[PDB]
Design a protein around this ligand. Sequence first.
Ligand SMILES: [Mg+2]
Ligand SMILES: [Mg+2]
Ligand SMILES: [Zn+2]
Lengths: 286, 294, 154, 197, 236, 150, 110, 166
Amino acid sequence: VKKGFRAAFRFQKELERQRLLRCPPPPVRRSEKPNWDYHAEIQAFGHRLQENFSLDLLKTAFVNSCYIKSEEAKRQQLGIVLLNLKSNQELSEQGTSFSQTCLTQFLEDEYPDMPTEGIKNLVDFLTGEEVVCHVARNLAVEQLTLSEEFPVPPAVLQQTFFAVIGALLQSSGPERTALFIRDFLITQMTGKELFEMWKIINPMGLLVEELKKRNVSAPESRLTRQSGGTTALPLYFVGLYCDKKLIAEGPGETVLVAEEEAARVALRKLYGFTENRRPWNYSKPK
Amino acid sequence: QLSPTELTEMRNDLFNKEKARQLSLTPRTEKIEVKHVGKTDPGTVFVMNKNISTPYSCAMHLSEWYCRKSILALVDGQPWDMYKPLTKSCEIKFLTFKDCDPGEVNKAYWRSCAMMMGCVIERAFKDEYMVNLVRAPEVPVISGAFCYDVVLDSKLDEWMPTKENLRSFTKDAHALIYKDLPFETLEVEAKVALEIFQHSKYKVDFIEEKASQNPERIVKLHRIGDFIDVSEGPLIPRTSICFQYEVSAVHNLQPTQPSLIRRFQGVSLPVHLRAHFTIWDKLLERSRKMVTED
Amino acid sequence: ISHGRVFRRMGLGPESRIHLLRNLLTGLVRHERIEAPWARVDEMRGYAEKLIDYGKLGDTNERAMRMADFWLTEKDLIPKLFQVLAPRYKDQTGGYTRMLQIPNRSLDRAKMAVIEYKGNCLPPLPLPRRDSHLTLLNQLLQGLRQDLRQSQEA
Amino acid sequence: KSGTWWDEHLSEENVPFIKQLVSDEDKAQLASKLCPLKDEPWPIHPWEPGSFRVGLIALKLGMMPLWTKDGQKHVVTLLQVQDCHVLKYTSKENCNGKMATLSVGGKTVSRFRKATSILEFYRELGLPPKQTVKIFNITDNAAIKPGTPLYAAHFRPGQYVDVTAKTIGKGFQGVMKRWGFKDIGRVWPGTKMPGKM
Amino acid sequence: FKTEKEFMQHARKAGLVIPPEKSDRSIHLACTAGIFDAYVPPEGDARISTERMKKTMASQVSIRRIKDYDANFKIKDFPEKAKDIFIEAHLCLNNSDHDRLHTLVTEHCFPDMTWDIKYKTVRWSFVESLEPSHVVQVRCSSMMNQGNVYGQITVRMHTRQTLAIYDRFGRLMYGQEDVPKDVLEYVVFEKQLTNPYGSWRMHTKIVPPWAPPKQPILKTVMIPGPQLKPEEEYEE
Amino acid sequence: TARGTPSRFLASVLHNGLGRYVQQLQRLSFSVSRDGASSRGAREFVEREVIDFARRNPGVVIYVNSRPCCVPRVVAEYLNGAVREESIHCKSVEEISTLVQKLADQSGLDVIRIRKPFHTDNPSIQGQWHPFTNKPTTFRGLRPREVQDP
Amino acid sequence: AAPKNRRTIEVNRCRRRNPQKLIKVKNNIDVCPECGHLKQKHVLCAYCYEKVCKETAEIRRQIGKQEGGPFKAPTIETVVLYTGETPSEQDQGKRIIERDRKRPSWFTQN
Amino acid sequence: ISRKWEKKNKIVYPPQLPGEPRRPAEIYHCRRQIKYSKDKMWYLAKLIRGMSIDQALAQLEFNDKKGAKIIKEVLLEAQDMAVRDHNVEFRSNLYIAESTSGRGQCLKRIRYHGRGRFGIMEKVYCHYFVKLVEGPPPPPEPPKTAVAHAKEYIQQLRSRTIVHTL
Ligand SMILES: [Mg+2]
Ligand SMILES: [Mg+2]
Ligand SMILES: [Zn+2]
């Protein structure tokens, strides 16, 4: 036994760290932890985004139907005043509708040659559960969301995000909300190749249909380049020619894969969604 | 009309339904006192569940050596399947290939091997041709081979299996052995059995024949995977018990005029009774010779 | 190099080896069934077989009596050899003894064998038994044998 | 899963029967190769300078004294040819050698102690399995049809022959018996040390 | 050797002369080993739903002794009180409330209730009471050591209960979670009438032979036969 | 260490700055002792600096909890969920002001080795080099020592 | 020669855990048909052998009582007779050993 | 000393919901202060890892080493405990999940050397630990095939990035 306190106390804190790592506690909501004031957190949410949210509308956006039901059950069993809480169902509908039409107008203006099926798939990806939940989590939406289950279910989180967009639409109008859609949803396709967002099968079939609409001749596949054809690691470049004029060329480990890639390259060029296309313009309208 | 793939689905669905129906007959757990009367572990009592537990479950209570070697069971002195639920309290004994008198075990292996051949041949032929399984003749194991009576399509009357075609049958059979499929058994009334084999006239005749022998009109059905067949006696638990399996030859049985019945023949040995390559060849030759049921 | 060396090296040398075998052989004749290390029982088995052959010469034979006198330390066994063991095997030309490996003994895990004189009163040893003829493999071979008879007859 | 040998599962009745059955076929398989010249033999060419005919596998019976008319003694070794047959022929191209190769087999051995693959090779040839198989380098005019029996009269008195075999194994021996023996910082590769002789 | 005789037989064979111990202090028991006068439940009692006078008289004699120690005691109130004690005791099993359970049950009952379920999960609920419980018997012990007088009251309870026992791994081994089932139980309650703090606590249950066999267990069981040494031969 | 520590690539949170700039710091929690020499700087910071900082950063919510403590601390929480605890023990007001502003400007990403000092999602405008980028094509795509009209 | 350096645990595990050092799995184990206990194919069953030895020891103890001394080996054959058995015509003129037990099923009178 | 292994059997799991697949039972057993070296015991513990309870008992029965009998008794005790106290249905339906040896508390004894030097000899003890899991033995991972090797190699080539550039 060595006399002293500082070393023993420091080692106690060390042991507590291991006790945490060995058994990581079950994650809980931020609202339950210390240093939480809902009203202050709601106000910072708007100012942080440089938006003049209506506090009454913004608070309703975070109220999910599931939360209202769970609160009532808790109150009833623990018998104890009428609750008039309005859910975010109405706001999320307005936000979802505006987001779908706002994103459609944005994409149609940028990519006039994109087919409606392509535009819809991009709007589905941008408003998809994956993209929206990622954006909502990184904007503190989940921390302010009122839900029965934590972590907020993807579906509930997506509904709350569009409800917030609905509150912004009523508060600041369509023009302001559109810049919010552009800054947080349109940016999500940065770096992504078209077919990563819009999933297609048989690109060659789609290419033939699009060329017919344009009256162009059916594409002919030819071997532009070839290397190590009789090896486990071969390389093939396949070029598509219309009237003996190259429209696209694609690489592949097999001739079939290269031919399919060439079709995808042709579709990207036709729809004006090439890798080296003009970047999205974020300059403040002027 | 139902196609091959569709016919199997209908048979399995009716087989599955009756299997569920028999289970529902006893809604609650009921305990039967099964007493082991074997030479080893004498006096053991199994308090198994009625209509759910099987002889194999009793073997699992004793040891793994009982599970591996128990080809058949003697429930109240009657040959019983390892996976066949025990209906009531009784006495149980386990049979192996190396017993002093494995006559019942040898018959079960021969029947199960014949049934395995029915599955291979039924699915081997092209869709265009129609294969009809007449029956599996009961041939003593001392005959040299097991056989199945099949009526091939009229268009194949001239066609005769070649040496390469026979090897193809064995590869399919071995594929069945590799799958290691349990032999499921259902004892159903003749009415239920007739519905499953309505398409085949030969099976309906056989089903009525066996049903008449029994006073309760109950027919034993067996299934390998998706293949359902009618059998006269118990079968081995799994197809993986077979190690050496060959389809020796196919012989046409007179009179050809009414119908051309082709006797597909084969010979097999279990893992426990493996034969040497040289000895296996001698057994293979005599299997090719035609077998006459007596 | 021990090419063609039929005999084992045991005990403290040649003379000790013979005495060790003699003691085992004397015990076998009296008890008719003994258990000892496998190598020693195997080494002694040859002497056990040959001792019966000398007993068949008869007690009147001088050379046979000298052999029994040396190899049987307990003299009451000598009458048993000539008058009991030898007549027992009068019909057999050999194979007087059977030797079977038994589980390794607990102390030193030595490989162990049991050797007995065939025909003793003692309870029979659990001899290994070949599979029944009625087995599936034997029945297939029995059918094959029957067919080869018909073919040979034709 | 466990191991098995040929007669493990045979009954007392079927061990003698199977032993006879496999012995009778062997005797009948060796008697069916006793007339190679009426079984569609390969072309028989005349000997030419530079030709290399096949050899044979023999068993070493022992040694005997032999005397010559000049009064000298000579010790000879008796080599007996037992069930020697040609097993395989390989042409120059496929053999990866300048000369074609003829595979020859030696003493007949039990089929119960041979690998399945080897058992399948002899089944096609129609001969009982052999104990040893050796390769002889031959010219294209010395090719013999696989299955042809080879006899001791393949060699004639007055001829010289190289004889190859494995030497008597002496086990791990010391330098004195192995090599007859009673500083660069390392032992050279190939240094004569104790080892298996 | 477990038995004390074998221990003292081993101790005399070891020369370990253990002297006995005398002290003013002794073990203080709050309950008794068993029932003072076993109450045989009349056969056919479940079927329905001078000797009687003699048996009833014994209860009248005993109830007087109970009144002597506690004057404010009504046998009419006990069935309702006993029902509450029975339900509370079993509820303690659901949450392993042993310290509370000790107040509701005696030291004789406690081991039986909790020992087997030490590493199991018990879910039990009292659905309903089919017929009112009534005090079938009342007995009282004679003066015992330390001047301890005990009173035992047997209450017949016919109730609808639900029981589901899970094993150590959360897997159901007995019963059904929600299905109500009918149970007829005779429950003896004991109280140390001498102790100034004794209270009526569950003591034991009476199981008549005619009682129907209990619910079958889910899993199959193997009862092993005689394990014989090599010399011993098996005999049917 | 580089080999003994983790690493990551240069990144941003939600492409911050592409459409608009969002301050990643959202919450600051201060623990300050009413009595305690080590909290003297933190107490002075709360009196004269916290209010002006709060107005400058409306997006950040600041919780000041005055309680007995030996080591005053500031816990900074970011939008990406990162939590960064710092000690202001015995620090002057200027030092605390510097640390707090430093937390305000950080993104919340792990302060670990960054492999490259640049990140782009579109490295090439003209097509990434491949072995055929600078190889001429040949008539009928014939290979070396290949014969047309085989 | 003394070791030049301490061998590391890494090196020692490679030596100690090499397949050559590991216990080989046995494939010749089987179940005895008579008693159901385990045995090796080439070795007598331990359970069955002990059963024979136990009875053999009792018979030898009985032989000792009849001989009643050393160097008294009989010059005639011996026959063991269990309770309820009488000397056979073949088993006549032979030393009789009486066992106070029923003849074991495995022990068959010849 | 440490005796955590004994306490593992005391863990109680919450009742499983009907949807959840039946959780296999786990039985922990050990024997402390065996008079044997852990080094020698390790080979026996290693041998039965992953075997079925019956296969492990068979192998140990015919093992000459002294540790085999000791481990066999522990295994038989664990098998009996599983069915009796841990609600295991079939005694044969168990396999060796974990089998290890551990250093026991050893005794130091005064020993001697041939030249009169004074030595300390340790009398070695060890612990044997076993964990049995309900169910059949998990099948041994098969050998890596040629197809698997090719897929891995091609995957490595495809993961290559242009190093040290934009
Ligand atoms: Mg020695
Ligand atoms: Mg040698
Ligand atoms: Zn045995």
